C-alpha cells in the first residue's frame, strides 16, 4: 500500500504537469488566425485567373505558354501592388514583400538518352526525365549574365527539394527579379522572347518570401512547376508559414520559460528510464509502457536537437537581410521547421496515449486494458493476412487503372485510394470509364470480401475474447463466493 | 394491481396530452414555406455575381476592391426595385424593405501593437486583431456627421455579435443609409472618394430588415463582412425570419390557447417533482427517470422565461417603427428568438426519449432497456479511453494540417472533421496537398485503429451484455420450470 | 414423402414460369436506349442556357425576368428547328414535335388574406399561398380570347398535379401556342407587354409533347414552374416516355402473348389461395408466405385492373390527335402509366422474394431461415424504440435547421437526410453555416448514440439469436447420438 | 519431421523467386510517369473548349452541329502545332504524330424499320437503332473517292470495338486526313458542305496515334461518338498507351531475362501438377489449394499465348509505317494489350494470395485459417440469400429509375450502385427528382433490410464459428491437460 500508491501519485503529478506544459507549446507555436494568412496568398496566387479575358487558372496550367501567361501578368500583379499616397512595396498593405523573388530552372542535354534506329529518319533530338547524371552544365543560348550559366549546389546556398514527379536537386540557371514592377516584366519579357524556358526545361521554381508586421510571421513560398518529359505541364506549391523573430511580448517569455521546463522535464525522464536501465539488464524492453516511454524520450531529445543545432542560429540569415535589398534564402530554415512542427505533434501524440498508464484506479476500466492486451496477438496475427489481401488487391488495381484514373496513379496513393474505399469516398464514375470490363469487377469483389467478410474478423476476434475475460472475471467472483 | 397499473395511467394520458400539445407548438413555431423564403433572399444577396462582366459574388470577396464593387453594384440593385407602374420600396414586389439599411464599422488605432526593432527601417506602422482594449475611439479624415465619430455600444441600442475569426463588440462608425436608391449611390461613392474603408478597420456589418405582407413574415440581414490583420477578407451571412406579430388567424387563437395549456402542464409537473423531493429528500436524484423529468422541467421555465420576460414586450420597437422612416433596430429581439427556438427544439428531444418510461408493457421491449441499462456503466468507461485517443488524434491533425487544410482550422472544428472521417466524407485531396509524408500516415493509422479496432469494442461490450441477459431470463424461466 | 416433395415440385415448377413470365414483361416495359432519349430531352431544355450573353439556365430561374427571357429564347429554340432542305416542325431531327405546346396559369385574388392594422399605411394589397378556396375566378386585364379568361377543371379535360410547395387542381388561364416560330414569339411579346404574368401568379405550367418514329416511343413534358408567395420562383420538369402504340414487330405479338399467359397465372393463384380459404376458415391469415401470395395476388389485379380499365382504352385521343392540329392531352394517361409501372415493379420485388419458399432443401440455407424467423420478434421490439430516438432526433434537427439548410427543408425529407448521415454522405459544411452551436453538437450526438451504440443492438440481436440455434441444432445432433 | 518440412522448404523458396520475378515483370510494364503522359493527351482533345468564344467541350457535346466545331476547331488545333524556328508536325513539342488521323463513320438505311399506319400522313421516313442487318451498303451523295464508298470489314484491316450503347462492327465509310494542317481544313469544310454526317449515321470514329521519343511509347486514340437513334449525341474516348519496341537499354534485356525465366517456372509447374494427377487420380480436385495452383498455371499459359501468337509478331506494322506516309493502324494490337495487361494482373493477384499456403507455421495464424475454412460453408449458404434480395432491389430500382437517373441506367450498373449506396456514396438528389413517392422509400427500405439486419448476418455467422473453434481449441489444451 505505501510504495505502490506514493510511487504511483509521484509518477502522475509529475507526468500531468509535463502534459500541461507541452499543450501550452502547441498552443503557442498555432496561433488561430495562421489558417487565414495562408489562406489569403493562396486565392492571390493559385485560385486567381491568369489573364483578364480567360478562364485558365495556376492549378491548371496545361501549356508552356500558359505558365508564360502566368509569369508576365497574375504572378506580378499579385507581388507588385500600387503604392497607397521610398517606393517599397506590399502585399494586401498589411503584408511586406521581402527583398525580390527568384525565378530558377533545370536542364537536360541534349541527347541524354538514346532513341531506336527505326526512327532516326524524322527525329533528330530527344532529352531524358531528370536525374543529377544527365543534368545539362553547359552554357546556353546568349552567354548573358548568371540568368544563363549553370552554377552548382555548393556555390549556391541552395538545397534539394521533394517534388512530385521526381525529386529536383539543387540549382543550375536563375534570375533574380526586381525590387520594382517595370524592370521585372522587362526581364521575363526578354527571357520569352530568347526562349530561355525550352523542350528539355525540367524544374522551374518561382521563389520569394513575405512578412506580415501585424502578427509578426514570415512566410515563403514555393511555386514549383514541374515539366514531365511527356510534353505537358504540372504544377504544384508550397506556403510555409514561420515565426522567425521570438523574443516581443508577456506570452513568448512565458513560452520561452515553459520551454526550458519542458528541458529540464525530459532531463528528468531520461535519468529515470536509464537509472532503471541500470536496475533491469535485459527485463526491461519487453513491457510495453517502459517502450514507450522510450520512445517519447528519443523524439524529445530529437526535437531539442533540431531547436538548438539548428533552429535557433538562423537569425544571421535574417541579419544579412537587414543590410539590403537582394534575394534573402529562408528556403532552407523552412524545411526543418516543418521537420520540428511534424516530431513535436508526433510527440504529443505519443505523450496523450501514455496517459492511460494511470488510468486504470476503477473495475471496469481495468477489465476493458485486460483485454485490449490479451487480443493484440491475435489482432496482429489477422493484421499480417488483412494485409496480404490488401496489398494483392491494390496490386491488381494499379495494373488495371495506373495508365487511366488518378487515383491509383502511384503505388503509394493506391493504399490510401483503397482505405478511402472501404469508408465511402471513391470516384466511382472514372474508373468505369478506365475499363468497363474489369473495372466494376474488381470494385465488387474488394467491397464483397474486405466489407463483408474480413473487416469483421476484427471483431470477432475482439468479441470473443471480451467475452472470455468477463467469463474469466466471473469465475474470479464465483470462486472467491466458493472460498469465502 | 390496482395503485400500479392506476398510477401509471394516470401518468401516461396526461403525458400523452402534453406532447401532443407540444408537437402542436412545433407545428405552428415552423410553417413549410419559411425555407423558400429565406432561399430567395440569400440567392439575392449572396450568390448573384458583384459586377456585370465578372465572375466574383459575395461569398467568395477576396479583396477590399471587391467589396466595394458589392456595395455599390449588386447590394443596391438588391435592395432598391424600380417602382411598379409615395416611392416606398419593395423586394421581389412582395417583400418590404423596412426604412432603411445601415454600414457599421469598427476600427483599431495606430500602433497597437509594437514592431520588432530589426525593421525600423521599413515598417513605420502597424494594426493588431481586433481587442476591446486596442479599439479606436478617437475621430477620423473629414469630421462630418456620425458617419466618422465614434459612437459607445451604451449610447446605441447595439449588442455584441460573435463573428468568425473573432467576437465583435457593440458599435463604433456608422452610417444610415437613404430610403431612395440614387441618394444612397452618391452617399456609397463619397464613403469611398475618402476612404472611410482601410487598413486598420476590422469588422462591417452591412444590416437591414425585410417584411412580408403575404405570410405575415419579417425577417433580419446581417451581412458580416471580417477583416482579418492577416491582410484580405473573409465573409458571413444571417438569414433568421421572425413572427413578430402573432394574433390575426383562427390557427394563431388556437396556438396561443395550446401555449396557455403548456402553461399549466409545466406548473402541474413542477408541483409533481417537488411534491416527491418531500417525499424522498436525498433517495430521488439518482433515478434516471426523475434526472429527465427534472431537466424537461428546467427547460420549460426557461423557454417560458424568454416568452414573457423579453420576446413578448418588444412591440414597443415595432410601434416606433411605424411613426417613421430611420432605422429600425430588431437584431436584439432575433437573438432571443433563435435561443428561443434552439431550447424549444432541446425540450422536444428530451421530451419525445421520455416516451420510453410507458413502453415498457411487453416482455421484449423490457429485456431490451435492461439490457442497455446493464451496459451503461462498460459503455460510459470505454467512451472515456475512446474519446483520450480521438483527442490525441485531433490534436495530432490540428498541428500537422492546422496551417494549410479548411478542415482542420480551429480546434473546434477538428474533432468534427474526424467524426466525419469516420462515417465516409472526408476531403482526401486536400490532406495530400498538405503534407504527403505524415498526412496520409494519419489518415491511415486513424482507419486502422478507431474504424477496424476500437470502433468494435462499443459493440462487444453490448454484444456480451445482451448475451447474459439473455442467460440471465433463460435461467429465470428454467429455474421457475424447476420449482413448480 | 409422396404428398410433400410432388406437392413442392407442382408448386416450384409452375412458380418458376410464373417468375419468366414476370421477367419478359419487365424486360419488354424497359428498353435500354430510353434512358438516353429522356436525357438528351432534358439538355435541351433544362440545362442549356437561358440567352445568348449570360450564365443562368432553366434549373436556377430565380426572377419572373428570367422566366419570360426563358420562354422567349430558349424555350423556342428548343421546340422549334429550322425545316430541312408542309411546314412540320422536329426534334433533333429525329424526333416529331406534336401538334403545339400549351402556356397554363393559375391565379389568386386580390385581398385573399387579411393584413394587419399597424401596416396599414404603406401596404395597400395581398395574396397569399394557392388554395383552391382563394384561387380566382374573375377576369383579367384585356377580356380578349381564351388566354385571359377562367375555365373550370371538368370544362377543360385536365387534371390535379402534385407541384412542390402545394398541389395545384385543375386549370384557370391559359394560351394554346402556335404551331410556327414566328407566331409563338409574336404571342409571348404580347403577353409580356400586358403584363399577363404578375404578383399574385401562383401556379404555371408549359406543358407539350413529342414522338420519336424510329424507336415508336411518345414522350410527355410538364414544366412546372411555381411562384411561392415569399416571392422569388422554384422550378421542376417530368420527362415520362410512353410506349402508347403497342403491335408492330414480331417482339409486341410475344409480349402480348406473354401479357395473357400471366392473365391465367394470376387467375390460378387466386383459385388457390381462396380454395385454401374454404379449407383453413381462420387459420390461414398468421402464416408469412401465405400473406406474402395474397399481397402479389392484390397488386397483379390492381396491375390487371389499371392496364383494362383506363391504360388500353386511350386510343381514343391519338385518334381525334391524328385528324388535327391542336393540343393533344397525354397528360392523363401519363398518370397511370407510372402508377401501373411502379406497382408492376413492387409485384416483381415481392414475387422475387417469395422464391425463399423453395430455397430450403439444404441444410445450411434451412438454418438461417430459422435464425432469421427467431429473431424477427426481437428485431421488431428494437426498431420500435430505433426509431422514437430518431424521429425525434429529425424533430430537432427540424427545429434547428429547418430555415437554413435545403436538406432538412420538409419533415418528409428530414428523415431521409439522417439516413444518409448514417450512411457516409451529408453536407456539413452548410449544417455548421446555419448554427454554429448546436448544429455540429446534433451531429456528434446523432454519430455517437446511432452509429456507434444503437445500430450494434440489431447486430446484438441477430448475433445471439444465431448462437442459440447452432448450440440447438448441436444438441439435437448430440441427444440423436446418445439415442442411437 | 524430415519429408514434410524439406519438401515445405523445396517449395517455398521456389515460389518466393517466381513472385519475385512476377513482380518485376509488373514493375516492368508499368512506368510511374505514364499517367501523366496519358493525363495531357487526355487535356488536350477532351477537356479543352471547341470554340475560343463558347463554353462547351468534348465531353459535353450535345448537337451535331457541336460535334462539327470540334472537328473544324479543336480537334486540329490539337493535332497540328506550328513547325518550331521538312514539315513534320509534333504534339507539345516533345510527341510525335504518326502519320495521320482516319474519319470512319457508319449508317443505316432508309426505311430500315416500318412505321404505325396511323402517323403515315406526316411521317415519311425511318431509321433504328444500329445492326450489322440494317447497316447500309449503298453509295452516298457524290460519288467521290473512297470516302463516301462502303468498305467491308475483311477489305479494311479493322476491327469491331465494344461502344456504349450498342456495338459497332468493321466499317463502312472513311476519309484519310491529310498530313498538313490547311489541307486537312478543306476536307473537313467540303464534308460538312455536302453533309456527309447527317441522320441515320451512328458511329463515328476519330482515330489517330503519336509516339514520344523521350519514353520510348506509343499511344493510341480512338475519338468514337455514337448517335443514339434517339436523337442527340454520346461521347466516349480512349487513350492507351503501348510500349510497342522493346530492346533498348540495360533495364530491357534484364526485363526479357525475367520473362524467360518465368516461361522455365512456369514450365516446371506444370509439370509439378500434372505429375500430381497422375498420382492422384480423382482425390486432387477438392483441395482448394491445389485448384488454385490450375488456374494460376492456365492463365499464364494463356499470357504467355497472348504474348508470343499475337504481341510479339506485330513488328510487321511498324515497319510498313516506317516507309510512308499514310495511315497506320495500330487498333488491332492496343485490344490484345489491354486483354494481356488484364489477364497479367489477374494472375499477379492470383499468385499474391497463394502465399497463405506458407503462413501457417505459427499458431495465431494457423487457427484463424481454420475459422476462415469452416465458416465458408455458411457464409456460401447466406451468400445465395443475400443476392436474392439483392438482386430483386436492383430490379424494382431499375423499374423505377430506370428512365429518369443516370445510376440506374442499365441493369449492368444498376448492382454497382447499390455496391456504392452500401458503402456511403450516392447521389440522393436526382432518385428524389426522379420519383418522390417510391424513390425514397425504396432508400429507406435497402438501407433498412440490407445495412442494419442482413450485412450482419455475415458478421454474426463468423463471429459465432470463430467462438466455437476456440472453445475446441480450448478443450484440446484441456483433454490434453487432463490426459498427461
Ligand atoms: C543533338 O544530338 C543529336 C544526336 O547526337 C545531334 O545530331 C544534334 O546536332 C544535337 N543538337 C544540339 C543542338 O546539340
Ligand atoms: C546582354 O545583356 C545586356 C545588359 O547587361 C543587354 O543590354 C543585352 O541586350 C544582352 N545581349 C543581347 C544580345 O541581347
Ligand atoms: C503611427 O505610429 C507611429 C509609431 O508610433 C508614428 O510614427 C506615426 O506618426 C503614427 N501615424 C499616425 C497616422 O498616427
Ligand atoms: C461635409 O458634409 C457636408 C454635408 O453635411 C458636405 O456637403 C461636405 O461635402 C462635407 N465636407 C467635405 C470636406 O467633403
Ligand atoms: C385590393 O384590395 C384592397 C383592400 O380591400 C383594395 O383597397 C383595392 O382596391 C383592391 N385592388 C384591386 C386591384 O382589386
Ligand atoms: C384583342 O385580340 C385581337 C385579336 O383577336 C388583337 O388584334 C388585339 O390587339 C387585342 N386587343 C388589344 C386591346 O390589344
Ligand atoms: C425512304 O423510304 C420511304 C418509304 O419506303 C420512301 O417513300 C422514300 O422514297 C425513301 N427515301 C429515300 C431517300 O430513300
Ligand atoms: C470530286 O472530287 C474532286 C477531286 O478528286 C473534286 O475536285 C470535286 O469537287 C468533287 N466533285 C464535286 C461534285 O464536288
Same mark, same amino acid.
Not at 493559385?46 to 487558372?57: A, C, G, M, Q, R
Not at 524556358?197 to 525540367?202: A, K, P, Q
Given at each position: 500500500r505505501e510504495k505502490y500508491l506514493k510511487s504511483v501519485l509521484r509518477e502522475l503529478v509529475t507526468y500531468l504537469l509535463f502534459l500541461i506544459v507541452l499543450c501550452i507549446l502547441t498552443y503557442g507555436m498555432m496561433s488561430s488566425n495562421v489558417y487565414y494568412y495562408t489562406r489569403m496568398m493562396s486565392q492571390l496566387f /493559385?485560385?486567381?485567373?491568369?489573364?483578364? *479575358?480567360?478562364? *485558365?487558372?495556376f492549378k491548371t496550367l496545361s501549356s508552356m505558354e500558359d505558365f508564360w501567361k502566368f509569369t508576365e501578368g497574375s504572378l506580378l500583379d499579385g507581388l507588385y501592388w500600387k503604392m497607397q499616397p521610398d517606393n517599397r512595396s506590399f502585399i494586401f498593405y498589411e503584408n511586406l514583400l521581402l527583398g525580390v523573388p527568384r525565378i530558377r530552372q533545370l536542364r537536360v542535354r541534349n541527347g541524354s538518352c538514346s532513341i531506336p534506329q527505326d526512327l532516326r529518319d524524322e527525329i533528330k533530338e530527344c532529352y531524358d526525365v531528370y536525374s543529377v547524371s544527365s543534368e545539362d552544365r553547359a552554357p546556353f543560348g546568349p552567354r548573358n549574365g548568371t540568368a544563363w550559366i549553370y552554377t552548382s549546389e555548393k556555390d549556391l546556398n541552395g538545397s534539394s527539394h521533394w517534388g512530385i514527379i521526381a525529386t529536383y536537386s539543387g540549382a543550375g540557371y536563375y534570375l533574380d527579379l526586381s525590387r520594382t514592377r517595370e524592370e521585372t516584366a522587362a526581364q521575363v519579357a526578354s527571357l520569352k522572347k530568347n526562349v530561355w $524556358?525550352?523542350?528539355?526545361?525540367?524544374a522551374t521554381f518561382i521563389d520569394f518570401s513575405v512578412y506580415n508586421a501585424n502578427i509578426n510571421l514570415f512566410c515563403v513560398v514555393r511555386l514549383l512547376v514541374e515539366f514531365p518529359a511527356t510534353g505537358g505541364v504540372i504544377p504544384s506549391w508550397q506556403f510555409q508559414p514561420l515565426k522567425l523573430i521570438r523574443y516581443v511580448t508577456t506570452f513568448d517569455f512565458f513560452l520561452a520559460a515553459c520551454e526550458i521546463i519542458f528541458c529540464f522535464f525530459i532531463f528528468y525522464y531520461v535519468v529515470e528510464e536509464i537509472l532503471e536501465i541500470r536496475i533491469h539488464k535485459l527485463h526491461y524492453f519487453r513491457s510495453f509502457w517502459n517502450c514507450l516511454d522510450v520512445v517519447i524520450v528519443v523524439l524529445s531529445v530529437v526535437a531539442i536537437g533540431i531547436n538548438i543545432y539548428r533552429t535557433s542560429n538562423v537569425e544571421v540569415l535574417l541579419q544579412f537581410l537587414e543590410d539590403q535589398n537582394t534575394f534573402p534564402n529562408f528556403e532552407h530554415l523552412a524545411y526543418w521547421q516543418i521537420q520540428f512542427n511534424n516530431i513535436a505533434a508526433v510527440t504529443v501524440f505519443f505523450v496523450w496515449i501514455? /496517459? @492511460?498508464?494511470? &488510468?486504470? @484506479?476503477?473495475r471496469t476500466m481495468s477489465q476493458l486494458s485486460t483485454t485490449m492486451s490479451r487480443c493484440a496477438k491475435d489482432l496482429f496475427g489477422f493484421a499480417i493476412m488483412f494485409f496480404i489481401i490488401f496489398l494483392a488487391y491494390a496490386q491488381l488495381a494499379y495494373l488495371v487503372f495506373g495508365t487511366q484514373v488518378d487515383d491509383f496513379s502511384t503505388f503509394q496513393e493506391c493504399i490510401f485510394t483503397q482505405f478511402r474505399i472501404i469508408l465511402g469516398d471513391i470516384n466511382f464514375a472514372e474508373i468505369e470509364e478506365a475499363n468497363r470490363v474489369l473495372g466494376p469487377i474488381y470494385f465488387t469483389t474488394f467491397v464483397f470480401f474486405m466489407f @463483408? &467478410? /474480413? $473487416?469483421?474478423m476484427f471483431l470477432a476476434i475482439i468479441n470473443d475474447t471480451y467475452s472470455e475475460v468477463k467469463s474469466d472475471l466471473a469465475q474470479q467472483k464465483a470462486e472467491m463466493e466458493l472460498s469465502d
Open positions: /493559385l485560385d486567381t485567373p491568369v489573364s483578364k *479575358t480567360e478562364k *485558365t487558372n $524556358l525550352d523542350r528539355g526545361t525540367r501514455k /496517459l @492511460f498508464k494511470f &488510468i486504470n @484506479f476503477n @463483408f &467478410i /474480413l $473487416l469483421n
